[PDB]
Amino acid sequence: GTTYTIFGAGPAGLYTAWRLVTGGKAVAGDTIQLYEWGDYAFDGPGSGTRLPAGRIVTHFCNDDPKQSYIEAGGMRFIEWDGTKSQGHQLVTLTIQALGLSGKVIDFNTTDNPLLFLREEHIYQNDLATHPAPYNTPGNNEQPAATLFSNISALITGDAPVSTRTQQCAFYGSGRLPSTFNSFVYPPGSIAGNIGYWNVFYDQAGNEGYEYAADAGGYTSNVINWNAANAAVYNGEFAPGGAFKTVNGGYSQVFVQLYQQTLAAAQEAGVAFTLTQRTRLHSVWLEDDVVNYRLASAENPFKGGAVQTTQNAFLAMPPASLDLVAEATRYADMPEGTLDILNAEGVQLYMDGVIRQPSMRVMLFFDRPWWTDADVPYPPDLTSDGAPNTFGPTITDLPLRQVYYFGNNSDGTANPVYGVLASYDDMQYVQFWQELEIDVGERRKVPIDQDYQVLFGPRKATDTMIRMVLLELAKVHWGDPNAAHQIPWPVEAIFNDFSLNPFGAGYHAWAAHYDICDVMQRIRQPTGLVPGATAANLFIIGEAYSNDQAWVEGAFCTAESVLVDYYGMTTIADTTNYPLICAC
Amino acid sequence: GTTYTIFGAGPAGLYTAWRLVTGGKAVAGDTIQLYEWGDYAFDGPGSGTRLPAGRIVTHFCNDDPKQSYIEAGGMRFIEWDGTKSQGHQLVTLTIQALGLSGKVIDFNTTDNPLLFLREEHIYQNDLATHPAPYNTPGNNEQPAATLFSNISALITGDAPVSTRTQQCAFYGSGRLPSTFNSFVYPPGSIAGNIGYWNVFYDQAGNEGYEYAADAGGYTSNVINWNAANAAVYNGEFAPGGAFKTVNGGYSQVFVQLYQQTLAAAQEAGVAFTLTQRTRLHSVWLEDDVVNYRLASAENPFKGGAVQTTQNAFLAMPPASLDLVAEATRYADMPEGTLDILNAEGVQLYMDGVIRQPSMRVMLFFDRPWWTDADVPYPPDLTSDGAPNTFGPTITDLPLRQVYYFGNNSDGTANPVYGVLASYDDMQYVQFWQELEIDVGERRKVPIDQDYQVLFGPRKATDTMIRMVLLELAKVHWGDPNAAHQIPWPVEAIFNDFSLNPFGAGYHAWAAHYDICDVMQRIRQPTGLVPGATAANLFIIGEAYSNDQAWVEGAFCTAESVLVDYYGMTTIADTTNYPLICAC
């Protein structure tokens, strides 16, 4: 029979294995082999070093599955609304199909976030009366969302940008309107050749940009990504929907994809295996035949024997592809082979995204100190009918955003109250990295070989805890000395997504790319090599999706490959929902 | 005879060859082989694509050696004062020995820089009148240098940090004083295990940090580097002396090193060859024998036949070492070899510096428009006794500093007037990189393969020119609509030092490292590998020096290797001038 070989048991690799079995492509006598560098707990407590999978990681306080948790990776989704044709269609279908719809609950955010900006405390509702301390006339008396909407409208002009298909079309054909007013960018400029931050800066000045970057919601991006995509994803008509989470953590989706793939496989007669602590080391082609070597987690740089498959999925992000491509880039390859990942067009299209570093600090407290009556500036989390919101609080500090999960347990365990502290952006990666080593210690692991998130959230250093509490004191009291008022966390851990093999929290389409052409053609990179024999070697994952920073994008690129290159019947209604953009 | 093999004809590699011949270490019958990936113009017009060498590049307008020029890489040095024992000793001795001392001119800076901060225009002398628009009480009425000095004093306490030797000792043993007042850092903490930004932010708050980062200009350095080295380099006691430049360009130092080494080698009977467009591909050891492969610049990832030498200098920065290390990291190495750059201890010590990305835009004007009588906020460049100062103007924009070189031409009838625009820091690299491609064009070269600085300054795009003129209009007119008043540049070019093979403008010692032990021991990396046979394979350059961001550091590490490992008599007086820190 046929062997399907999947490198990476993140969302995209797990989803691919699940669809091949349940969708009926794999048949009795077929083999699905899944290889994962890490060691995720797919088989209950003690079966791994952290819950699956890749950048999704639910972290239970005390590694106690009955406790409060904080999502130490991705945390929420947008429920599919088929009547609106909007939301995360494949995540919603997959949650339903796995029997987890019963566990879906509201992820409520405050309508009135606290803003801590240039040593001022302003609840967002109060901006008309307490203007933000930014020299941006007009804009500083409105939520940052108003300025995002205004800049998007200066870019999109009269172009239709309400539907996912209209949005996809803008990426490739969107032009600055004939009325664009700039010294820098002429009217009718191709918006996909413009940096979002560059044009935001041009149109609103440094103070408008800084206000938007500091006071914008967690949806709002502001990095110098593709201005065509950023305008349609930051504008009034941005893709929206009700935020949900999966009670008990997003990670159970990945446990269930694995368990339910294994049970469907047994019924179907399909051999489905997961081989962990085992990475793809090197990959190349001999015509249609994929050649590859594996390496152990213990010795990740030294390849085993050369293996072959006819069907290989690289279910891994750019920084993970880079480490594989490095293993053949400098090598004398066998006669008649194609070093596919290092081909000029492949390397060029892999640069069609820019990377955003992220670090998350997860702190559990024995009480919800942020609700105390004497807290000068508490987060406004209280809702009349349904429960307390999760925040955020939004700041111009290195600690960019705070969410307050509090007790999200079934209520059975000893109540701990969780806080998620967000550090993001190239500006701050060097700031947070030195907090990762004890103040009494020297660095011991080369930075590029510290696979921290792959292993699991790492114990926060005393320096890192004290820095978070100092920041939370300035946010909630406006007095750095109030850090002494905050009770010491009962557990504190972190995830630094800038470290290999992830190399990014998020990917964002780059300026100077035809996004649809990359989304379409990078998936089967032999199509980027003039004269090459087609091979079933695929790149999948959120990075080169139309839903970056969502599991939805990992599912959509994987679905699009099964449809386009395996002729599978999609589980989606794609009538109004292209899995990826068509050109 | 004895063969010396030098990889990298930047300042360190050139200096090394020069000292080996003129110091009489290389004798009749010996060979010195120099390899350079680039194609620098060592032999006048038509002999390369840019003037030598590495990150020093003098750029003449219109490629006219009689026209005005801007330094498109390193631009100034501190003259050695042997009376006080302060300044760049080896650079000053080298310029004298090469017969270039007659070209040394003051590089004067204004004592009244224009500050453009949060849309306010403040000449620094007027901060008592018009406090900086930062919520940092008291600090905002005084130059940022005062805040830098006060933070340095909070870190150093009573410790002597006056001399180069005492500063070196502070790197390894310096502790926060008993009086240190912090929630985050205990009194007596090892300063070398603290990030400078981390502790500046702890002591001065985000608004004090932002003011220092935005208004410090000159050589101030707020990145999150080793706080022990940052405190002694940013404080009262910081290394000083008189700033100079080389009239006609710093590049002539490197032209003269090459030409005078060649003439001295011919007189001495030493075979001295420079082989350009030819890079080190891979390196490793067999006992004491250095094994290597070369690659052509045309095909930089493919090695040729294995070559051996007994004496090898890697005269290249971290990002360059990384590319060579990638070529063996994943390889199945010959029996009996040591893959020296990938050894754990070597990799760990290579991470003993952090990287600061830098982009320089060089613009030539047909007139000094910034001196026009109708300019609202002209720079205060005059000096009653002598030629104008060079600025800078200092801002909180992506364009963080402006230098005004004006007419430094030597004999053209039609002089141009030069302006240097500085973009720096991890915050802004993704902002400036999208300006490097025409707004009508897609990216065509993968970003990690675009060796722009190696080839020479690149023509500024129309978008990049317009972006700079917009920023200059905000700065000097306080109105972005005034950009139309600035004459379009005669020529505009850029150098993006973030690109390979440089991967940094600047290196800075990292927190959580014993700087002296790295500085000493990385030079001969076999000493970081337990059980390794000692080999004459050396790492030299500014990056692991005690003078990072100066040519002086390139010369000092090279000189330290010649003294410590080849028994040469130093040209320096080291009485008050350790070449590198001693532990």
Ligand SMILES: Cc1cc2nc3c(=O)[nH]c(=O)nc-3n(C[C@H](O)[C@H](O)[C@H](O)COP(=O)(O)OP(=O)(O)OC[C@H]3O[C@@H](n4cnc5c(N)ncnc54)[C@H](O)[C@@H]3O)c2cc1C
């Ligand atoms: C801070 C943060 C917050 C997020 N929040 C949300 C959110 O709220 N909702 C949401 O839906 N999404 C969220 N996301 C995004 C979500 O995490 C990603 O979209 C998703 O994890 C992408 O899945 P993937 O399979 O493409 O990649 P990954 O999750 O990156 O998985 C790739 C896998 O490949 C493995 N791998 C790498 N190299 C090799 C190799 N050589 N051999 C074998 N295996 C290898 C990795 O170890 C990993 O398991 C968030 C992400 C971050 C970082």
Ligand SMILES: Cc1cc2nc3c(=O)[nH]c(=O)nc-3n(C[C@H](O)[C@H](O)[C@H](O)COP(=O)(O)OP(=O)(O)OC[C@H]3O[C@@H](n4cnc5c(N)ncnc54)[C@H](O)[C@@H]3O)c2cc1C
């Ligand atoms: C924006 C800027 C401003 C600066 N200002 C000043 C200043 O005012 N004054 C000052 O004194 N210094 C200044 N410097 C610093 C100065 O440029 C450096 O200290 C100096 O260039 C370091 O010399 P080096 O030989 O260590 O390395 P580099 O100058 O980086 O030279 C390394 C050489 O190695 C070559 N190479 C790399 N890989 C290979 C390979 N595999 N095989 C062969 N060759 C290879 C490179 O092409 C290059 O020629 C500045 C730097 C920058 C970026």
